[PDB]
Design a protein around this nucleic acid. Sequence first.
RNA 1: AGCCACCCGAGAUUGAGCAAUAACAGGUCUGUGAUGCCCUUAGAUGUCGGGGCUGCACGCGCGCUACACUGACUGGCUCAGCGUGUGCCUACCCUACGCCGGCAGGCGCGGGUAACCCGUUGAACCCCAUUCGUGAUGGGGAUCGGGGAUUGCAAUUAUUCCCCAUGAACGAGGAAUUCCCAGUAAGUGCGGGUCAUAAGCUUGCGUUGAUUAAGUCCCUGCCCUUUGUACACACCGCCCGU
Lengths: 75, 137, 52, 191, 141, 127, 53
Amino acid sequence: RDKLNNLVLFDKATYDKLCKEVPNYKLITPAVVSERLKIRGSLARAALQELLSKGLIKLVSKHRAQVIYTRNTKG
Amino acid sequence: PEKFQHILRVLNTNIDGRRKIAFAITAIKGVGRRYAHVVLRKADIDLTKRAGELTEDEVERVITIMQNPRQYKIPDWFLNRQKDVKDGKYSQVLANGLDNKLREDLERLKKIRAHRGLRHFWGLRVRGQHTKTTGRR
Amino acid sequence: TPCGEGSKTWDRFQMRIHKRLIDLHSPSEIVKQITSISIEPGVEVEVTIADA
Amino acid sequence: TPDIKLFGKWSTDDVQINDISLQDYIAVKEKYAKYLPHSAGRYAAKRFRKAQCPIVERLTNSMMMHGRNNGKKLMTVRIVKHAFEIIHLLTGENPLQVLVNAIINSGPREDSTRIGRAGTVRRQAVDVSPLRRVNQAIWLLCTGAREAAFRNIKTIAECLADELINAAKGSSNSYAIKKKDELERVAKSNR
Amino acid sequence: VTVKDVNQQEFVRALAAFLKKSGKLKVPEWVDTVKLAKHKELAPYDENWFYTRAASTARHLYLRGGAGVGSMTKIYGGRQRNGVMPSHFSRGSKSVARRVLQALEGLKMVEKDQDWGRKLTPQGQRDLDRIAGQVAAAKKK
Amino acid sequence: VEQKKKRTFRKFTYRGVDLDQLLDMSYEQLMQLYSARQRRRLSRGLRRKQHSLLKRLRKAKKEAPPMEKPEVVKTHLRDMIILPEMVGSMVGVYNGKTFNQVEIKPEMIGHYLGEFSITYKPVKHGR
Amino acid sequence: QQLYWSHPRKFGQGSRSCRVCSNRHGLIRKYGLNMCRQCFRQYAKDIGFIKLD
RNA sequence: AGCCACCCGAGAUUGAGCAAUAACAGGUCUGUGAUGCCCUUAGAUGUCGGGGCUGCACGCGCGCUACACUGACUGGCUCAGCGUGUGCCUACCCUACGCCGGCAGGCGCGGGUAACCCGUUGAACCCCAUUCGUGAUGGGGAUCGGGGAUUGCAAUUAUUCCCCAUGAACGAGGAAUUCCCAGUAAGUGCGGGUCAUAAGCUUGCGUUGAUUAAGUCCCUGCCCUUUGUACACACCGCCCGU
C-alpha cells in the first residue's frame, strides 16, 4: 500500500487560503486542514495554533495526540 | 508561513523540509538520528524546525561541530570509530569516507586472513550464529 | 515424559511448608521446659532465647 | 442527575428511533442512560444480557479490534468522546441522534442464508432479526472508521464521525450503506 | 494538605520553575550528548528536563519516609527495546538520578533522614506548599 | 623473518597502539593500553598456564637465525592472543584434526591464532 | 603413573551430576536436591512432594 | 425421573487432581550398580588436550519481531500479584542505602534462611502535555564495521552486555491451516527452572480486556441401534482380466 505526501514547507498561499476559507469549516482538526490544503499535518496543527491568536478558531480539546478546534463559538 | 530560507547542503545531499532537522540530515552516512540531534543541541539550533527553514549560517555551524567533535565536547564514546585502526585517534567518519574505511577493514583482514575477513569474503555469516536455514530465502 | 516425543505434558508437584510463631513472656527455663516436653515425632518445635 | 442521566458532555434527551422494527435493541434512555459506559465487562454471561447493553456501549466495545488495539477500552473511550464532539461541530444536533439514524439506515432488512439447490450457487431469501441488524450495523461502521484511518492522516475519531454522518442521511461515501445495498439486492434475487 | 490533593502535573511544573528562580541546580557536565536511559531511542530534546526531574523527585520523596536512587530510576524507567527480542522493563540512568538527589540536598529541599536516603526538609516542605497553593487555585482536573 | 617494516603495509594502530611502539613494549605495558579482549585474558589468566608452549616458541626462534623463521612450533591452543614477544615465529595452530601453519607477522598482533586457522570449508552443496 | 586424571569443573551442567547416577541436562540444584529430573520422578514420593494441582 | 423461569445470590454457568476393560512391537537399555545375550575391555568403547553440534544453492514446523498514529518520539502521572533468597554433602544469594561513570559497569557499607531484609514489591499495560503526520517515515532492527566492559584458567567460530555508525525485507500474506465462549481471545509486564557466564524457551502469576454460537450434527471425530460384507494381520483390507 500507499504513498501520499504533503508539502512539508510552511508556505505563503495556504495560510491565506485557510483564513479566507473559514466559513466552510465548523470542524477543524490538523488532518482536515492538511487534506483540504497541501499543508503537512504537523504544520497544519501549527497554523491553527497561530490562527487561534486571531480567535477565528476556539479550543474545545487540548488532548496530547491531536487537538480539536471549533470555528468561532460554534460556526 | 515562512518559505524563504530553503535548500541547505550537508555533505553531498540536498536537505529540505521533509522531517525535523536531525532526521533530515541522516541522508548521509556516518550521521545517525542520535548524532545529528546532539550536533544541533551543541550548535544552539532548535531541531523541531524544518530544513527548508534556517539559513546557510546554521548549516556551517553544524558542519564545523560534527567534524571537530572533541573540540566542542562531543565525547569519544559517542564516535563511530574509537581509536580506529587507521589513525591513532578517535575520528568521526562521514559521507563517502565511511564507505572507504569499511572496504579498507574488510580487505585488511583478508590479508591478515582473520576469521571476520575470510567469512565475509566467502559470503558465510561472520557472526557464529545460525545460518542453517536463514541468511537466504 | 522421559524422551520427549508425543505431546507436551508437564507435571507440577507442590510441597506446602507451614510456619507459625507464638511469643510467650514468663520466666526463663520453666517456659521452654514445660512447652518442649510431651512431644517427640514429626512436628518441629524450636524454642528461642530471642526477644528481650 | 437522577432526573435524567446525561452523557459526559452531551444530552441523552431528544434521541428518536426512526424505525418501529429496530426497537428494543436501540436505547439510550429507556433505562440505559450512562455518563460513562461500563457494566461489569462481561456481556457473554447470559443470552439475555445483550438487551441490557445499549448501542453506545456496544459501539465502544466493537471498536477495539486488531491485535495491538485489543483490550484497550480506555483508549477507545477517549477516542469515542472526541468523535462525538467532531459530529456535533459538523452537523449541530445531538451526536447520539446522528448515531441512531446511522444504525437504522445501515441495518439490512433481507439478507441470505445458504440453501442447497443442485450444488449450484443459490441461496434462500430470509429476513434477519433486529438484534442481528443492530449487531451487523455497529460492526460495519467501526470497521469502516478503522479502515480509513490506517493509511490516511485522519484519526479513528474523525473517520468514525464521517462514517456516521454519511450513513445518517445517505451520501454513498459510507462503507456500511454500500455493503447493505449489496446484501439486500442479492437477497431479492436468488432462487 | 498532602501534595497529592493538588494537580500532580501542574505541581511538578510549578516547582520546576521555582527551582529555576533559585538560580542553582548544581548541574552535570553531562546532559548535552547523553544516551540517558536505555529506554530511549533518541537523545533528549533539550537540557531543560533536569529541573522537571528534580521537582518530580522532590515530590516523590515528600510522599515516602526516605528513599534514594532506586525509587527514581524505576519511575522514570519504562519499556526497553531489546531489538528483535521481547520488550521488557529495566532501570535506566543512575548518574543523573544520583546527581538530582545531591543537587536537591545542596539547596536543602530534601536531606538525609531515617529510613535511609533523603526525606523532605522543612524548607522544602514550605516551598512545595507555596506552589501547591498556586496550583490549587488554578484547577482541579 | 621477524618484526616490523616487513610483512606490513596496512600498519598504523591495531586498536590504539602503533606497531612500532607495540613491538618495543613488553606484553605487560601492552595490556595497559587499549587492548580490552587481550587485557581480560592476561589479567584473569595471569600468565596463563600455557608456560611450556611459550618456551617452545622462544626456543625455536632462538635456535633458528633471525634472518629466517623457526623450525615450526605446534600448539593445540588457538585462544592465544599474539603478543610482540611471539612475533616472527611460525606457529602450527591446531584445529582438532589439522595443524595449519601460520607465520605471525606484525599485522596479526592482538588478534587470535585461531582466526588464521579453519575448521570450516567455503561450504558447498556441489558448488 | 597418574599425572592428570582430573581437571577443574565448576562450570555449566558438566560439573555436577545426579547422586545415584551420572547424567546431564535438567539437574535440579534448587533446595540442594542435586538429582536429575528423571530420577526425581521416581523419588518424588520419598521427598514429600505431592500433586493436587 | 426431570425441564424451564423467578428470588436470594458464589446459581442448579470456575479451574485443576482422578482413570476402567483392553489394545499398541508408540517412546526409553542414553534416568536406572534394573536387566538377558552380544561386542569391547588394560592394545578401551573405563580419563585428559583440541575441534564439531553453531558449517548453507534449498524443503518443513513451533515461535519471535514487524508492518504503525490505541503508534515512533520527548517530558511527566501511577496501581500489583503468584513466588524467591546467603551462611547449602563436590558450590553459593537477594540488595535498600554512599560515591564514580551517558552507558555497560566499577566501588563501600548494612540487613535478611526471610510475611524481620530485598520489597509500604508503587512493575509494564494504563493516564497525560507535546513532537511527528501516515510518507518503508523516525514504523522495522536485519546485516556489517570500529571501540568499551562483564563471565571463565581457557570465548577462537561475536558465550553474553553496552556505545556509536552502517539502517534489509516487510506497508497485511497464496495454495492451505490452528486455536478460542469469560476475567475468556488479544494486548502487557513480572517470579521461578536451566545456570561460572548465557532466553527470542517453558511453567505459573497479576494487569488492560472484546466482537461472537448461546446452537447443531453439515463436514470431521467419537460413541447408539439396524443392515450388508468375497472383509478377519479386520478397507492404508480385498480383488479381476489383458
